[PDB]
Design an enzyme around this catalytic site. Structure first.
Site, PDB file in Angstrom:
ATOM      1  N   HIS B  41       0.837  -1.225   0.000  1.00  0.00           N
ATOM      2  CA  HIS B  41       0.000   0.000   0.000  1.00  0.00           C
ATOM      3  C   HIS B  41       0.859   1.256   0.000  1.00  0.00           C
ATOM      4  O   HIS B  41       0.300   2.308  -0.153  1.00  0.00           O
ATOM      5  CB  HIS B  41      -1.120  -0.033   1.031  1.00  0.00           C
ATOM      6  CG  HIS B  41      -0.688   0.219   2.424  1.00  0.00           C
ATOM      7  ND1 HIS B  41      -0.666  -0.764   3.361  1.00  0.00           N
ATOM      8  CD2 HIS B  41      -0.313   1.338   3.046  1.00  0.00           C
ATOM      9  CE1 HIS B  41      -0.293  -0.259   4.502  1.00  0.00           C
ATOM     10  NE2 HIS B  41      -0.073   1.013   4.337  1.00  0.00           N
ATOM     11  N   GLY B 143       2.084   5.740  10.304  1.00  0.00           N
ATOM     12  CA  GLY B 143       3.487   5.536   9.986  1.00  0.00           C
ATOM     13  C   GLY B 143       4.085   4.253  10.505  1.00  0.00           C
ATOM     14  O   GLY B 143       5.274   3.998  10.256  1.00  0.00           O
ATOM     15  N   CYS B 145       3.165   1.178   9.730  1.00  0.00           N
ATOM     16  CA  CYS B 145       3.103   0.043   8.822  1.00  0.00           C
ATOM     17  C   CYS B 145       4.506  -0.423   8.462  1.00  0.00           C
ATOM     18  O   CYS B 145       5.452   0.371   8.351  1.00  0.00           O
ATOM     19  CB  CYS B 145       2.333   0.418   7.559  1.00  0.00           C
ATOM     20  SG  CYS B 145       0.569   0.467   7.955  1.00  0.00           S
TER      21      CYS B 145
HETATM   22  C1  LIG Z   1       0.230   2.202   8.011  1.00  0.00           C
HETATM   23  O1  LIG Z   1       1.242   2.989   8.615  1.00  0.00           O
HETATM   24  C2  LIG Z   1      -1.136   2.491   8.619  1.00  0.00           C
HETATM   25  C3  LIG Z   1      -1.206   2.022  10.083  1.00  0.00           C
HETATM   26  C4  LIG Z   1      -2.458   2.495  10.836  1.00  0.00           C
HETATM   27  C5  LIG Z   1      -2.525   3.991  11.072  1.00  0.00           C
HETATM   28  C6  LIG Z   1      -3.280   4.123  12.376  1.00  0.00           C
HETATM   29  N1  LIG Z   1      -2.974   2.864  13.053  1.00  0.00           N
HETATM   30  C7  LIG Z   1      -2.566   1.910  12.229  1.00  0.00           C
HETATM   31  O2  LIG Z   1      -2.382   0.726  12.519  1.00  0.00           O
HETATM   32  N2  LIG Z   1      -2.179   1.831   7.836  1.00  0.00           N
HETATM   33  C8  LIG Z   1      -3.165   2.484   7.226  1.00  0.00           C
HETATM   34  O3  LIG Z   1      -3.282   3.708   7.281  1.00  0.00           O
HETATM   35  C9  LIG Z   1      -4.204   1.638   6.479  1.00  0.00           C
HETATM   36  C10 LIG Z   1      -4.104   1.821   4.969  1.00  0.00           C
HETATM   37  C11 LIG Z   1      -3.819   0.511   4.216  1.00  0.00           C
HETATM   38  C12 LIG Z   1      -5.152  -0.203   4.288  1.00  0.00           C
HETATM   39  C13 LIG Z   1      -6.170   0.875   4.025  1.00  0.00           C
HETATM   40  C14 LIG Z   1      -5.524   2.185   4.507  1.00  0.00           C
HETATM   41  C15 LIG Z   1      -6.193   2.800   5.732  1.00  0.00           C
HETATM   42  N3  LIG Z   1      -5.518   2.138   6.858  1.00  0.00           N
HETATM   43  C16 LIG Z   1      -5.953   2.068   8.128  1.00  0.00           C
HETATM   44  O4  LIG Z   1      -5.275   1.498   8.990  1.00  0.00           O
HETATM   45  C17 LIG Z   1      -7.278   2.744   8.468  1.00  0.00           C
HETATM   46  N4  LIG Z   1      -8.295   1.709   8.605  1.00  0.00           N
HETATM   47  C18 LIG Z   1      -9.261   1.560   7.675  1.00  0.00           C
HETATM   48  O5  LIG Z   1      -9.379   2.261   6.692  1.00  0.00           O
HETATM   49  O6  LIG Z   1     -10.049   0.523   8.012  1.00  0.00           O
HETATM   50  C19 LIG Z   1     -11.059  -0.056   7.089  1.00  0.00           C
HETATM   51  C20 LIG Z   1     -10.366  -0.523   5.832  1.00  0.00           C
HETATM   52  C21 LIG Z   1     -11.675  -1.218   7.838  1.00  0.00           C
HETATM   53  C22 LIG Z   1     -12.095   0.999   6.775  1.00  0.00           C
HETATM   54  C23 LIG Z   1      -7.129   3.606   9.739  1.00  0.00           C
HETATM   55  C24 LIG Z   1      -6.095   4.709   9.555  1.00  0.00           C
HETATM   56  C25 LIG Z   1      -8.475   4.173  10.169  1.00  0.00           C
END
Ligand SMILES: *[C@H](O)[C@H](C[C@@H]1CCNC1=O)NC(=O)[C@@H]1[C@H]2CCC[C@H]2CN1C(=O)[C@@H](NC(=O)OC(C)(C)C)C(C)C
Ligand SMILES: *[C@H](O)[C@H](C[C@@H]1CCNC1=O)NC(=O)[C@@H]1[C@H]2CCC[C@H]2CN1C(=O)[C@@H](NC(=O)OC(C)(C)C)C(C)C
Ligand SMILES: [Cl-]
Ligand SMILES: [Cl-]
Ligand SMILES: [Cl-]
Ligand SMILES: [Cl-]
Ligand code: NA
Lengths: 305, 301
Positions: B41, B143, B145
């Site tokens: 991603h 950040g 991930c």
């Molecule tokens: C990567 O650094 C990050 C880690 C997150 C940030 C907050 N706590 C964490 O664990 N990941 C993301 O931002 C991912 C990203 C890849 C998948 C889709 C994008 C959004 N996301 C999320 O973690 C969000 N969650 C969602 O969007 O959840 C659903 C997909 C179920 C709607 C989050 C920031 C709300």
């Protein structure tokens, strides 16, 4: 989001751990620059431990009586001296992995990470608090002595604890790296006991702020109190007094959440007087007191090292 | 004596953490030999995240679109490939700090250490478990991930988790290091929710054995139970079924303490029925399920 009991990354300390053997006793040492630090009770036989004259036992020992191993490599001991309850072994090689470091003495209520080691090899890491009764609730077996506790700031390792002993209630005692014990303990096979402990109030408040930050708010109420009134409740429940300095340290969390410290104290008062009514806070049914205000800010803001 | 939530020493993994940037997105990567592993991603924009076509997005990237930084050194990307939900960036320099390592996909109930990182730098280390609903209860911010989970039994690092996302209940989801998600989740911004979670029964039993090893007996009782009667009761409290595999793996701890596995099951039944009545077990007023039988033997012996 989330809140976990988090230790500092331990790599800078792993590169300092060595094995120290004297006679039939093996334990761990800390190798920094050209000195290995370890508990002085490494020189004792079981009979010596009953009433050791460490001064007199040490002059009996020579450099060659201490076998120091960094991994599979032997370090030549070229001198030895005692500082309080810590033995200092001068070696011929400076540790190329020595980090930026200093020796600090911590105060009760402060937290630190323990790198539990056996035979000079790191085996686990966990977070502890120096209890008000100057013990720590550690996890230590035979051969763990010389394991150390530390904090990190930016790139500087602050060593604050070296492990020496287990007390009969299963809690642990040790020294700072200048060999001064935390608490009224001695490195001798004689009757000793942990004193009655108390709860670290400022840390409980910090954890309640961490809970609010993480969406756990059921314990909040409309009420506030005064430092004077709350401290009478604290004394009643064997909580440490809350000082104005504690209130000031929590200022950042108060501004962030909208809950003044004395407003949170009224929440804590009602939790102490009424219990949790079957509910939990951050996954706990007890009030947690081993997160400091700084721990909460650092974890909830992603500080790195 | 004593019993703590104990992580593995993190240094062998610290030496592998790097920063990966693509476009405006920065996260962490894992640098092993001449390959940096990170969540795919990283190549997505905001508009892309609902229904990304990762194959189409990646073919449009040049090596120089990936900025990889190891401390103060920029690493040169010389190739790239996608494996499931992980991106593998080939770099021109092998990591001199690469430890002995393997990739392992774990089962629910297994525990591991997490080295939480931001901008390629470690923040802290803690213990997690793979929940029965294939989430983990982590501590992760923007950040984070690309932070990884691992065990280091013996001198070999077993990487088992890479972090990708946070679900609406505040729990976390990610992949093994081959890029396959744990559970039914996808790296898309479409609505997703964790299933109802349950308690890891075999781990609670391990922890009760740890409590006996550490000198507690107050929760023992004169009763036993059949395995099937235990499961009929335990499921009414949203506990996972206990299998004969679990009974077998608890054998060593049963032998060390002299308490038969089904005898300890009757203790657990009574604890679920009664609570602790103001007492604690290993410093907890709740039944803990994030220590495995293997963990108890590691720490108590
Ligand atoms: C990567 O650094 C990050 C880690 C997150 C940030 C907050 N706590 C964490 O664990 N990941 C993301 O931002 C991912 C990203 C890849 C998948 C889709 C994008 C959004 N996301 C999320 O973690 C969000 N969650 C969602 O969007 O959840 C659903 C997909 C179920 C709607 C989050 C920031 C709300
Ligand atoms: C050093 O490796 C070791 C660590 C211990 C072993 C079990 N868990 C630990 O934390 N320390 C000792 O073996 C010390 C030693 C120096 C002080 C006196 C010697 C015994 N000891 C202990 O920790 C014992 N505790 C006591 O004997 O406690 C009293 C002195 C209060 C009676 C312990 C092994 C029972
Ligand atoms: Cl609890
Ligand atoms: Cl690096
Ligand atoms: Cl597994
Ligand atoms: Cl393995
Ligand atoms: Na209030």
């Amino acid at each position: 989001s989330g809140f976990r009991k988090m230790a500092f990354p331990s790599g800078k300390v792993e590169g300092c751990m060595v094995q120290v053997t004297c006679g039939t006793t093996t334990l761990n040492g800390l190798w920094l620059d050209d000195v290995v630090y370890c508990p002085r009770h490494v020189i004792c036989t079981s009979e010596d431990m009953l009433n050791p004259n460490y001064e007199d036992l040490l002059i009996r020992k020579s450099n060659h009586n201490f076998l120091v191993q960094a991994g599979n490599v032997q370090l030549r001991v070229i001198g030895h001296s005692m500082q309080n309850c810590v033995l200092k072994l001068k070696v011929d090689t400076a540790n190329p992995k020595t980090p930026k470091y200093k020796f600090v003495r911590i105060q009760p209520g402060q937290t630190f990470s323990v790198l539990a080691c056996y035979n000079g090899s790191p085996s686990g890491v966990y977070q502890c608090a120096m209890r008000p009764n100057f013990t720590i609730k550690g996890s230590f077996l035979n051969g763990s002595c010389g394991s150390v506790g530390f904090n990190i700031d930016y790139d500087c390792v602050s060593f604050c604890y070296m492990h020496h002993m287990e007390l009969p209630t299963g809690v642990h005692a040790g020294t700072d790296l200048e060999g001064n014990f935390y608490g009224p303990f001695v490195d001798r096979q004689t009757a000793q006991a942990a004193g009655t402990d108390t709860t670290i109030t400022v840390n409980v408040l910090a954890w309640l702020y961490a809970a609010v930050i993480n969406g756990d708010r059921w314990f909040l109420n409309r009420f506030t109190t005064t430092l004077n009134d709350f401290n009478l409740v604290a004394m009643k429940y064997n909580y440490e007094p809350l000082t104005q300095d504690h209130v000031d340290i929590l200022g950042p969390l108060s501004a962030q959440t909208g809950i003044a410290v004395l407003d949170m104290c009224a929440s804590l008062k009602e939790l102490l007087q009424n219990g949790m009514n079957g509910r939990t806070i951050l996954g706990s049914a007890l009030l947690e007191d081993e997160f400091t205000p700084f721990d909460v800010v650092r974890q909830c803001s992603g500080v790195t090292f």
